[PDB]
Amino acid sequence: AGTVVLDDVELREAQRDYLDFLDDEEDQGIYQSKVRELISDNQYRLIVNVNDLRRKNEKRANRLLNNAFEELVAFQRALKDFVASIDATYAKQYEEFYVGLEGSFGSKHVSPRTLTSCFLSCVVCVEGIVTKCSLVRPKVVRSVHYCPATKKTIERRYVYPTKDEENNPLETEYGLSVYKDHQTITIQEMPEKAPAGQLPRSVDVILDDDLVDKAKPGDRVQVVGTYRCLPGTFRTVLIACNVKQMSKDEDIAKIKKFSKTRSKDIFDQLAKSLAPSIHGHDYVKKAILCLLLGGVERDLENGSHIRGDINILLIGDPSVAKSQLLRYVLCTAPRAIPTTGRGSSGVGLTAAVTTDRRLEAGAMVLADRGVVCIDEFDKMSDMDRTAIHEVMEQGRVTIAKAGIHARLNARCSVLAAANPVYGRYDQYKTPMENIGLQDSLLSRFDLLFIMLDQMDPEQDREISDHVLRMHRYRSAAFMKKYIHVAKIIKPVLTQESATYIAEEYSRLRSQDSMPVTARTLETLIRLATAHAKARMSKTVDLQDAEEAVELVQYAYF
Amino acid sequence: AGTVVLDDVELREAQRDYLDFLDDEEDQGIYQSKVRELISDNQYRLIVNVNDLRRKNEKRANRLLNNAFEELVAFQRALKDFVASIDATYAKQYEEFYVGLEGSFGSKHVSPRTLTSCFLSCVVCVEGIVTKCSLVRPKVVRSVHYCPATKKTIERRYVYPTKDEENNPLETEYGLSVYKDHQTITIQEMPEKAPAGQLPRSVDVILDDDLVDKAKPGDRVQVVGTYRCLPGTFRTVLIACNVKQMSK
Amino acid sequence: LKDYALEKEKVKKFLQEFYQDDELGKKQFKYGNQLVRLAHREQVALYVDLDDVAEDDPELVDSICENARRYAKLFADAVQELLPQYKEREVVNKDVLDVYIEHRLMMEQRSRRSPQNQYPAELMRRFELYFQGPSSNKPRVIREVRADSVGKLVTVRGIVTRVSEVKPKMVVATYTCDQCGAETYQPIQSPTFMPLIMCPSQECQTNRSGGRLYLQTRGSRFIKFQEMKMQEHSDQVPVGNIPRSITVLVEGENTRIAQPGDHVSVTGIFLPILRTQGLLSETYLEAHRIVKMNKSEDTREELRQIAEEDFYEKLAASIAPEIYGHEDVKKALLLLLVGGVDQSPRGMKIRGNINICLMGDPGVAKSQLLSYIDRLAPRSQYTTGRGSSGVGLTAAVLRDSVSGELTLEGGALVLADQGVCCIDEFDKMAEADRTAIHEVMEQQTISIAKAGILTTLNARCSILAAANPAYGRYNPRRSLEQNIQLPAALLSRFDLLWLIQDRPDRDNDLRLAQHITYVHQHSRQPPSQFEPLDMKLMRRYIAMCREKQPMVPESLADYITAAYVEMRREAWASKDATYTSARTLLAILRLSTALARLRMVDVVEKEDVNEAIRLMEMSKDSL
Amino acid sequence: SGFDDPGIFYSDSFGGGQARKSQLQRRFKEFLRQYRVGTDRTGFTFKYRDELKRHYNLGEYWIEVEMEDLASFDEDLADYLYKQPAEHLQLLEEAAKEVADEVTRPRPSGEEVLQDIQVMLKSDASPSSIRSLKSDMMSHLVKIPGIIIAASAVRAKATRISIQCYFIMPDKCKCVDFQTLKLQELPDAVPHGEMPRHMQLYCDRYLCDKVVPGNRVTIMGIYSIYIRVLGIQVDTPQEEEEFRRLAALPNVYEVISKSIAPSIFGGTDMKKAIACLLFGGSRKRLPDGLTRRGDINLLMLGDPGTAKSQLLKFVEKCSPIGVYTSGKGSSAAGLTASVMRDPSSRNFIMEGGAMVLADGGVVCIDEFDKMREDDRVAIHEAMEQQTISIAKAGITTTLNSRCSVLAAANSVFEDNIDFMPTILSRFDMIF
C-alpha cells in the first residue's frame, strides 16, 4: 500500500530494552564475549538463553513467548544495532542478522503429539527424530531489476516481475539481489514416548540459512521457532531459528544394592528374566541379554573406527520359540523400533519418494543407537539384501540417487530371524548357505544359533510342564533401569587381565584339529565387556570374561 | 501521490546538474546571493530565470519544459540540498522548498485563446485579467493520525482515515500535520487583443502557499505553472508556481 | 549503483591506452591487436584478465566481483561500440552470419532512439567475451558455494564426471512473415522458449491481419553449448563427508576442452535457472575460462636425514598402523603407492597399470585396509566393488525429469584418473563385469558396435583386486584348476596373486590382543620417537619426493638378466601348482621402478640387484 | 538465467479475405510529397517547401488538402478515396507526419519532437439536402450546409486510455480539443410548413471556435451515431433578362402591393410600405469608423378588429425568411441570443436566438410585448446596432444580428407611451 508508520513506541521500547540487555557493561560481558566470539568465528546467528531474558525483564520474556513475529524482528534489529556499535565494518558486510533461542521453556516445551493447534502463533520447542528431508535449493528473497530503457530500478520483497510500467524488458541485477537457502524437513515423537495405539503427528520444519547442514536425517534434534500457517483450511508450518543436536546418551540407590556380588549372582538370574515363558535355550538367553548391553560410543572426532554394532541372528524350526523371542525383546526394548519382512518403505534407504523431494529415512536409520528387531529375514528383497550388507561394515548408510547424496548414521545392532526356507533339520549342510542366506557374508554376524528339535525325550517332559504352570495364580521394570546405568559406564579393558582370556582363544581355534576364527577376537571384546556392564564395574573381571569364553565355546558346538 | 523510485539514475543526474547550476562558483554567485537573501528574508520560494538554465544546459531546459512534473520535483530537491549545504539549520526549519520560473519563453508564452489542449503537461505562461475569484481556505496535505490504543502512528499523503485497521479510535496530532493555504482564481484574455467574434476561453488557476494575497481580483497577472488534469467530467486546471503583477 | 556512462568511458580508456612490454620486450598494444582482430573477424574469443584491470583500478575489480552479469554485458556492449571505428575494408564474408550482418547494416543505412526499431545487442556480436578470475580471489571449495555467493564471480576446482557432446544452442531466433517482409527477432535466454505466432511487424500493427509467421534457421545466431557435472577433489573432502556435484555450463570457444576424469579450474557467474509451494530454482556455473599450466612448457645434509634412510622402514612405519601386521604384504602397497606416474613419453602407458590381486576377504580382516588405501592416497578417489547396479559404469537411455538428452557418464575406472582403483567383492561381479576388467589387460582397445557403448575409457589408474574365497577356505589337498572352477587362464592374466592362510600360529596370535588396544588409546602412534606433527603435512612430505625425478640405471639391466637364467629353470622344473612365465619379465622391470628411484647415488649401483630379487623371493613360493 | 525475458524485436521493412491497406498507405505518401501545381509565367519553384514550412513556423500544426488538386491531376485516384474515408482517414493523418518529416529536417534544438498534424478535407461539389442524411448513406463523406445555432466551450476528451499496473493518471494521456455545435438547415431547403430539422456537430483539434453562431457555413464530415466533422467553410444569365422586363415596368410598385396583402382590410398605403420592407434598404458602409443602420423596421399598430387573426397565418405563408412561434416559444430559447446554464457543471449552453437565425432577412415577431423584461435590456441594442451583445460577467462576444424587425403585437392601451419611450422612435408609424 505504501503507507508508513512513524516511530512506533512499542518497537522503540523493545529496541531500547533489548539493547540494554545486550550491553553487558555492569556484568562481565558474557553476551559481549559471545558477540566477539561470533564476529571472530564469522557466524551471524546469536543464541540467547531465555532464562536470562526472564531474569532481566520478565515482561519482555512473556511478550516474546506470547507474540513471536514482531518481537523477534525487533530483537533482530537490536542485535544489528549492537553489533554495528561494537564494529561497523562487520555490520556493513552483511545484510540482516538473525537470533536463535535456547534454554528451558516452562509450558512451551512440547512434543509433536502434544503440539496441538492451540500453540499457533507462539514460539515452541519440538523434540523428536527426523523422518524426511529434501535437497538444498535457493529461494529468492529480494530481486533487483534494472531497465536500460527507462534507467529505473525496481525492488520487490516476499508473479515474478517481468514487465515494466509499459512492458519494457527488464534484465535483473543478480549481484545486487539477495538469495538465501531453504530446506523442508519433518518430525515424529520418540518411539519410547509415542504410544502405538493412536495415529502419529507430523510437523513441518523450514530451515533458513546457516541451518541446512546442521541437521541430517535420522538424528534427534531440538527445533525452536515461530509456528505460523501458510495460506478456511490452513496448513501448519514451523519456521525454525535454532537447531541443536541430541547425542543419544530416583532409584539409583535401589540399583546399587542389586549390584553387590556378596549376596548373589545378578547375571545368572537376570538372563532368565527376559524370556519368561520359553523353556531352555539358557545359553541363547545369555546372548540376548548381551545384545542389549555393550558400548556404542568411542572418542571419534571427525572420523570413524572399530565399533560395537555387531548383531546376533537366530535360525531354527517353526514354533520353537524362534519367532517369539523377538517379541519379548521388543516389548521391554530400550530405544528400539520394530520392523519386519519386506517393509516396503526402504528398510535401509530413503527411496527418494516422488510425486511430492522427500527422503524417507528407513528402519535401520530411525533406530540409531538402539537395537533393531527383524523377523522373516529371507522375506527381504535382494536389493535390501545387497543394501543391508553395506550398513554393518563401515557403520554408515550410503544412498546415491538422482542428485540426492546422503550421509546417515547407522549406529545400530540387529536381532534377526528367518525360517530355513524349506529345511526342517538343517544339519547335513553348513548353515552358511542352508539357511537361505546366500552370501558367505553371514560370517560377519556375532552368533548363529540352531534350535533343531533333536530327539531329546528328557527335555521334552520339562517343556510340556513349563507351559502349563505359567498361569501364576500366586520384574519387567528392573531391567530397564539396569541398562541406563551401564550406558554411562565404560568398563575399560585391562591387558594384564585380558591376557589370560586371550590365551585360550587359540585353543578355540585348535578345536577343529581333533565357522571363522579370524573375527572371533572381535566378538570376544564385546561379550567380555557386556559381562562387566552387568556388574557396573569399570574394570573387566577375569571371572566375568571367563563366562564370555565359555559363551564362545558353546557358540560353535 | 507519494510514490517514489528506488535510486533512479536519471533523477540523480538531474539533481546533480541542477545543484551544479545553483552553486555559481565560476560566476559571481548571483543565485547564491539570492539564496542568502531568501534565507535572511524568511521567504521559501526561489525564482530562477529560465534564460540562465538554457545558457548552462539547453537539454535540461528542454526536458523541463516538456515534462514539468519530474524535472520540477528534482529541481526542488536540488534547492533543498543546496540550502542545507549552505545552512543546515534553515533547511531543518522548513519542510519543502518551492521553485518559480520567470524570464522569456519562446513558444510556450501563450494566451488563453492560444492555450489549447496541446500544451498538456507542459509549463505555460498565461496573460490576462482576473475575473472570478474565491476565498482563502486551508487545504490539508499531510494528516498525522495517532492511535492511543495500539500506540501506533499513521501518516497519509494526498476518504479521511477515521478507523484503524481494527476499528480503534484515532485522534489526529494536528501539530505534526501540515496544512497549506489554497485559492481558486480564473483568467480571461486581454480585452484589446481577444477578438470579439468567437467565444472566450476561461482557464482555472490554483495557487499554493505564498500566492493567495499576491494576486487579487481585477489586476493584471502573469501565471506560470504546470497544466495538469484532474480525473465523467474532465476539466483542465493550472497549478501555479509564480505569480507577478503586471500593469506598469 | 552508478552512472553507467562513466563506467563505459572508463573501460573504453582502459582498453584503448593500456599496454605491456612483455611481448619480446616490445610494446605491442596487447588489447589493441585483439580489438583489431575482432573488427576483422580474425579472432572469435576475447579474454579480459582482471589482473591488468586491478593494476590501475582495484575498485572496478571489486565492483565487477560484486556483480558479474551486468558488467559482462556492459563490456560486451563497449567492445561492440569500439569495433566499427577499426573497420578498414569490405567484409571478406567469413561465414553466412557475416553476410547477413553486412546486408542488415547496408539495408538499415539505406533507409537514411526508437525503443523497438533496433537490432538486439546479442544478434550483431560475432564476438564472445569472458572474464579470467583475478588472482586475488582464492579458490573456493564446492561445498562452500551456497546461495550467499549467487551472482559473484567465483572459482572452484573438481573432476569432470558427466560431459555431453557438443550441440548448438540458439541465442537469437529469426522469424520472417509473408506479408511484412521484415525480420522479427526473439532473443532466447532460458533453455525453453515459445515460438511466435503473430508477427510484431509495424505493417501488421496497422492491419491487425493474420500475420502467420514461419520460424527459420538461416540468419539465426548459434553458439556452442555443453553440459558438464563436476565433483569435489577427493583430497580435500573430509573423511566424514561425501563429494558433492555442481552443474557447469560452458559455451563458445571455451568448449571442447574438458575431458572426463580431468582436473579443471572453472570461473564463471553463479546464476539460477527456473524450470517454468514457493520460489524454487537450481544453480549452475557459466564458465568463462578453463586453465592449464603455463610454467610447465619448456637440500643440504646438515638440516635433515631423510633420503639416506630406506623408506621401507620410515614410510611404512607411519602408514596404516591399525593393520594387524603383515608388513611384508604392505610392502607391495608401497609399490602401489608409487605407481607408474613417472613414465617415459614413448607410449608406455602400461607402467601405471598394476593389476594387483588378493584372495580371501575373511583373512585377518584385511577387507578393512582396502578402503584405507583410497582415502590416504592422494590423487586417488574412493571406489566400490559392487556398491550399485550395472548402470553405474555403462551407459543407457531412460526417462529424465530435470535434464539429460542421451548424456554420457563414466564408470569406476574413469572415476579414479591415473590413480589407485579399488574393487571389492570380486566374486559377486558378473561375467560381463569380469570381461570389462579383462578388457583393460588388452591395453585399452575398446571398440564396441553396440548402440549404447562406443567409448574408449582412459584406464590409467592402478587396479587393486580383493577376492573372497569361494564358499570355503583353500584346500591343501586339492591343487588349482580342480578346486577352483574359474579357469586359471583368466586369473593368470593378473600380474600378482596374494593369498593368506590363517595358520594356527599361537605366538603371533598373542600379539594382536595387546596390539588392538593401542589404537586411539594414546597419542604416541608413531612409537619410534617421531614428533607428532600436523596430519596435513604428512602427505606434503611425499609430494616433494616425487618432484625430484631421479634416474634409474640402464646398465643394471644386464646384470639382472644373468640372474634370471637360473630363476627360470628352477621355477619350471618344480612342476608344482605355482608357476611363472614370460609375464615375470614385466614384473622384474616394474620392480626397479620404485626401487632405483629411492637411491640417489648416481655413482655406483649394486644393491638394487639383491633388493629386486628380495621382492621376488617373498612373491616366490607364496602359494 | 531462466527468469528474465527480453522483449520482442522487429526490424525495418526492408525488401519488397482481409484486403491489404499498405498499398493505399503508399499512395497517400507518394502523392503528398511529389505533387506539384503552378504556372510557367510566375516561374518554377517548389511552392510547398516554404509554404508548408511557414505553416509549421506559425505553429499551425495543420495542413489543408484540397481534393480538387487530387481530382485535377488524376480523377481516377480521387474517386476511389471518397468511398470509405472513415477508416482510411487516420492513415492519411499519420502520413502527413512523415511528409513534415521532410522539410522539418533540421529542427532548432527545442522543436525536437515533431507533433501530430491534422488534415481537413474540402470539396466544391454541390451539397445535398438533409434528405440524404438517412441510414442508407451511412459511413460515407457528406456535404450539408446550414446555420449554427448552438456553440459550446472548449472541453477535454481523452483519445487513448491508460491503466496502472489504483487511480487512472490523466497526465500521461494526451487530450484534444472539443467543441459542440448544433446545425440548422437553411430555410430554403426546409419545406414551407415544417419544423426545421436539427443536427449536432462534433469538432476536432482545429475545428473549434473557427465559426460563430449565425454564420452561413458548409459542413463536411461522416455521418455516424452525429456528424464527425472534418472541415467547415465560412462563406463570403438567362433569368436576368426576364427580371429586367419586370423591373423596368413603371407601375411595378403598385401591382406588388395588392398581391402581398388581401384587400379585406388595410389601406393601399398600408400595403405599400410592407413591400418596401421585404426589399429592405441598404446598409451603407462608411469608409471611416462606424457603419450605418440602413435598415428600416415597421411596427404594426392601430385599433384591433381588422381581421387580425387571418393576418397571422397569411404572413407565415408569404414570408421568404421567418419563424412561426407557438405562444411564448419553446424550451428556454428566447427572442434574443441569450445563454443558459448547463445542468451539469454549468459548462456552457449557447441557445442562440431567433433574430440570429434570420441574419440578412426579417423575423416575424409575434406577441411582441409579451417577451420578458430580462431580454429587453439586450434587445434594444441589437435593434439599433444590428448586433446582439452578451451582458454576462466576462463574455464580450457580439454576434451578428442585422435582422430587420417585424413585430406584431396588440397596441398599448407622446401620449401613447407606456414603458419604452425609445423603442417607438426606432420603428415606423404603420397602421
Curated annotation (Swiss-Prot), chain A:
Query: What positions does the entry give for ADP binding?
Result: 324, 359-361, 363
The UniProt annotation puts motif Arginine finger at 443-446
Respond yes or no to whether keyword Nucleus is given for this record. yes
Residues found modified as N-acetylalanine = 1
Q: Where does it primarily localize?
A: nucleus
For this protein, the Enzyme Commission number is 3.6.4.12
Q: What keywords tag this UniProt record?
A: Acetylation, ATP-binding, Cell cycle, Chromosome, DNA replication, DNA-binding, Glycoprotein, Helicase, Hydrolase, Nucleotide-binding, Nucleus, Phosphoprotein
Please name the GO terms of the biological process aspect recorded for this protein, alphabetically: DNA replication initiation; DNA strand elongation involved in DNA replication; double-strand break repair via break-induced replication; mitotic DNA replication initiation; regulation of DNA-templated DNA replication initiation
* The reaction(s) this protein catalyses: ATP + H2O = ADP + phosphate + H(+)
PTM comment: the record says:
Acetylated by MCM3AP.
Q: Has the keyword Nucleus been applied to this entry? A: yes
Residues in coiled coil: none
Q: Name a single GO cellular component.
A: MCM complex
Ranges where the MCM domain occurs: 266-468
Q: Tell me the function of this protein.
A: Acts as a component of the MCM2-7 complex (MCM complex) which is the replicative helicase essential for 'once per cell cycle' DNA replication initiation and elongation in eukaryotic cells. Core component of CDC45-MCM-GINS (CMG) helicase, the molecular machine that unwinds template DNA during replication, and around which the replisome is built.
What does the further note read?
A: Early fractionation of eukaryotic MCM proteins yielded a variety of dimeric, trimeric and tetrameric complexes with unclear biological significance. The MCM2-7 hexamer is the proposed physiological active complex.
Self-association or partners: how does it assemble? Component of the MCM2-7 complex. The complex forms a toroidal hexameric ring with the proposed subunit order MCM2-MCM6-MCM4-MCM7-MCM3-MCM5. Component of the CMG helicase complex, a hexameric ring of related MCM2-7 subunits stabilized by CDC45 and the tetrameric GINS complex. Associated with the replication-specific DNA polymerase alpha. Interacts with MCMBP. Interacts with ANKRD17. Interacts with MCM3AP isoform MCM3AP; this interaction leads to MCM3 acetylation.
For this entry, the protein name equals: DNA replication licensing factor MCM3
Curated annotation (Swiss-Prot), chain C:
Binding residue positions for ATP 1: 324, 363, 365-367, 468
- SMART domains xrefs: AAA, MCM
User: One Pfam match, by short name?
Assistant: MCM_lid
**What InterPro entries does UniProt report for this protein, alphabetically?**
AAA+_ATPase, MCM, MCM7, MCM_CS, MCM_dom, MCM_lid, MCM_N, MCM_OB
Q: Which reaction does it catalyse?
A: ATP + H2O = ADP + phosphate + H(+)
Q: Which residues carry this modification: Phosphoserine?
A: 114, 344, 479
Q: Where in the cell is it found?
A: Nucleus; Chromosome
Q: Does the keyword Cell membrane apply?
A: no
What PROSITE patterns does the annotation carry?
MCM_1 (PS00847), MCM_2 (PS50051)
Primary subcellular site in the record, as a coarse category: nucleus
Write out the ranges of the annotated region (Interaction with RAD17). Answer: 500-543
State any GO BP term from the record: DNA damage response
Kindly report, in one word, the top-level EC class recorded for this enzyme.
Answer: hydrolase
GO MF term set: ATP binding; ATP hydrolysis activity; DNA helicase activity; single-stranded DNA binding
EC number(s) per UniProt?
A: 3.6.4.12
Q: What else is known?
A: Early fractionation of eukaryotic MCM proteins yielded a variety of dimeric, trimeric and tetrameric complexes with unclear biological significance. Specifically a MCM467 subcomplex is shown to have in vitro helicase activity which is inhibited by the MCM2 subunit. The MCM2-7 hexamer is the proposed physiological active complex.
Describe its partners and assembly state.
Component of the MCM2-7 complex. The complex forms a toroidal hexameric ring with the proposed subunit order MCM2-MCM6-MCM4-MCM7-MCM3-MCM5. Component of the CMG helicase complex, a hexameric ring of related MCM2-7 subunits stabilized by CDC45 and the tetrameric GINS complex. Interacts with the ATR-ATRIP complex and with RAD17. Interacts with TIPIN. Interacts with MCMBP. Interacts with ANKRD17. Component of the replisome complex composed of at least DONSON, MCM2, MCM7, PCNA and TICRR.
Task: Please explain the role this protein plays, according to its UniProt record.
Answer: Acts as a component of the MCM2-7 complex (MCM complex) which is the replicative helicase essential for 'once per cell cycle' DNA replication initiation and elongation in eukaryotic cells. Core component of CDC45-MCM-GINS (CMG) helicase, the molecular machine that unwinds template DNA during replication, and around which the replisome is built.
Q: What is this protein called?
A: DNA replication licensing factor MCM7
**Where is the organism placed in the taxonomic lineage, from the top?**
Eukaryota, Metazoa, Chordata, Craniata, Vertebrata
Curated annotation (Swiss-Prot), chain D:
Which cysteines share a disulfide bond?
A: none
Natural source organism: Homo sapiens (Human)
Name recorded for this polypeptide? DNA replication licensing factor MCM5
Is Cell cycle among this UniProt entry's keywords?
A: yes
Q: Where is the signal peptide?
A: none
Provide the binding site for ADP: 292
Annotated Gene Ontology cellular components are:
chromosome, telomeric region; CMG complex; MCM complex; membrane; nucleoplasm; nucleus
Name of the top EC class for this enzyme: hydrolase
Q: What Gene Ontology molecular-function terms does this entry list?
A: ATP binding; ATP hydrolysis activity; DNA replication origin binding; helicase activity; single-stranded DNA binding
Q: Which UniProt keywords apply?
A: Acetylation, ATP-binding, Cell cycle, Chromosome, Disease variant, DNA replication, DNA-binding, Dwarfism, Helicase, Hydrolase, Nucleotide-binding, Nucleus, Phosphoprotein
Other notes on this protein? Early fractionation of eukaryotic MCM proteins yielded a variety of dimeric, trimeric and tetrameric complexes with unclear biological significance. The MCM2-7 hexamer is the proposed physiological active complex.
**What disease is linked with this protein in Swiss-Prot or TrEMBL?**
Meier-Gorlin syndrome 8: A form of Meier-Gorlin syndrome, a syndrome characterized by bilateral microtia, aplasia/hypoplasia of the patellae, and severe intrauterine and postnatal growth retardation with short stature and poor weight gain. Additional clinical findings include anomalies of cranial sutures, microcephaly, apparently low-set and simple ears, microstomia, full lips, highly arched or cleft palate, micrognathia, genitourinary tract anomalies, and various skeletal anomalies.
What fragment of the full-length protein is this? Answer: 2 to 518 of 734
- GO biological process, any: DNA replication
Family, according to the entry, reads as follows: Belongs to the MCM family.
Would the keyword Cell cycle turn up in this protein's UniProt record? yes
The record's subunit annotation is: Component of the MCM2-7 complex. The complex forms a toroidal hexameric ring with the proposed subunit order MCM2-MCM6-MCM4-MCM7-MCM3-MCM5. Component of the CMG helicase complex, a hexameric ring of related MCM2-7 subunits stabilized by CDC45 and the tetrameric GINS complex. Interacts with ANKRD17. Interacts with MCMBP. Interacts with TONSL; the interaction is direct.
> According to the lineage, what is the superkingdom?
Eukaryota
The gene it comes from is: MCM5
